[PDB]
């Protein structure tokens, strides 16, 4: 197919992840040997095609992830799949760049912690003791503007 073979090459190109010879790539899968896959690759951003020698890349750094997190303010949500093909082991980078340096959405630690784009200042704020969270949650937040009334009584 025109869509299956070119997609097969792009994943094959994606799997390589390095600038390979235009001859090394075409024989890599033995499927994208027609000009349609290359033309689709050149017409699209799936495979980076340039007038120079055979170089296959995307159209990627912990610093850039900060830029990426900054660029995802007031915007949609992106998975870490482009962050996992995208500076491999960004989970290491997220844990190392903790405290908002590489924020994460850790739904659970069994799916490579599939996270999203998150922007924060403190990010981690693990200084707050766990019991303090309990005794924080131990307190139930009250009703309407008597809450300003109670605290003026307390002087807050």
């Amino acid at each position: 197919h025109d869509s299956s073979k070119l997609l097969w090459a792009t994943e094959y190109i994606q799997k390589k992840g390095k600038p390979v010879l235009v001859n090394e790539l075409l024989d890599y899968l033995s499927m994208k040997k027609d000009d349609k896959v290359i033309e689709l690759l050149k017409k699209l951003d799936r495979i980076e095609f340039d007038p120079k020698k055979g170089t296959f890349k995307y159209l990627h750094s912990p610093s850039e992830l900060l830029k990426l997190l900054r660029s995802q303010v007031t915007f949609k949500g992106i998975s870490c799949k482009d962050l996992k093909d995208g500076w491999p082991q960004c989970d290491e980078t997220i844990n190392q760049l903790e405290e908002d340096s590489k924020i994460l959405v850790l739904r659970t630690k069994k799916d490579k912690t599939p996270r999203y784009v998150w922007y924060n200042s403190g990010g981690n704020l693990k200084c707050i003791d766990e019991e303090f969270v309990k005794m924080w949650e131990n307190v139930q937040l009250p009703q309407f503007a008597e809450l300003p009334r109670k605290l003026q009584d307390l002087g807050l």
């Binding site: 303010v73 007031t74 915007f75 949609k76 949500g77 992106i78 998975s79 924020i103 994460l104 959405v105 850790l106 739904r107 999203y116 784009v117 998150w118 922007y119 924060n120 200042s121 403190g122 990010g123 981690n124 704020l125 693990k126 200084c127 707050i128 003791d129 019991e131 303090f132 969270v133 005794m135 924080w136 949650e137 131990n138 307190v139 937040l141 009250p142 309407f144 503007a145 809450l147 300003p148 109670k150 605290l151 307390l154 807050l156």
Partner: protein, 191 residues
């Protein structure tokens, strides 16, 4: 502006006293004044099973409240906009009340375990004291036997717990200082 410190303190308490997905949604809500839930859903890119409770906590914390903002759809139907409206005065006042209830409780804990006096029996495990037992001292004895087991007693209490409570108030004040920094800073204009 005073609102950013209101926002910054909110992100502080909710990153410290709540999870990260809480601050992800709060920023998401803070990303747009009138934010559709659908855009919020795609930003999180997670199931509704992981979006609602975080919004519920923000509603419970009164940091952000649900506003029935008039949305007139173009499909000849009636669709509301699920756009969160941040209730800042009720956000900070509630946080203060939590702060006030958390500090006095742990303050009360400090006074709970301060002073040792009284015995026990360690055989039948019944508590004792100076006085009831000195009633029980015998002229031929130096130590207080037990009424029950006829078997001498031991002392019991430990002020260690008061020290344990002293550290907790120390720990809570260290945790609460940036919170009460922002609150008083917010308290200038009541915003």
């Amino acid at each position: 502006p005073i609102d950013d410190i209101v926002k910054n303190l909110l992100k502080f308490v909710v990153r410290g006293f709540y999870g990260g997905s809480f601050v992800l949604v709060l920023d998401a809500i803070l990303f747009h004044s009138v934010l559709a839930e659908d855009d919020l859903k795609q930003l999180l890119s997670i199931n509704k099973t992981e979006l609602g409770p975080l919004i519920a906590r923000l509603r419970s914390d009164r940091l952000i409240s649900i506003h029935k903002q008039r949305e007139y759809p173009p499909n000849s139907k009636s669709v509301e906009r699920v756009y969160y409206y941040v209730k800042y005065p009720h956000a900070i006042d509630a946080i203060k009340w939590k702060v006030h209830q958390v500090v006095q409780r742990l303050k009360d804990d400090l006074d709970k375990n301060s002073e040792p006096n009284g015995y026990m029996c360690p055989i039948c495990l019944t508590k004792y004291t100076q006085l009831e037992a000195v009633q029980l001292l015998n002229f031929d004895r130096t130590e207080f036997l037990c009424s029950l087991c006829d078997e001498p007693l031991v002392e019991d209490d430990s002020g260690k717990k008061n020290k344990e409570k002293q550290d907790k108030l120390n720990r809570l004040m260290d945790q609460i200082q940036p919170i009460i920094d922002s609150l008083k800073k917010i308290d200038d204009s009541r915003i």
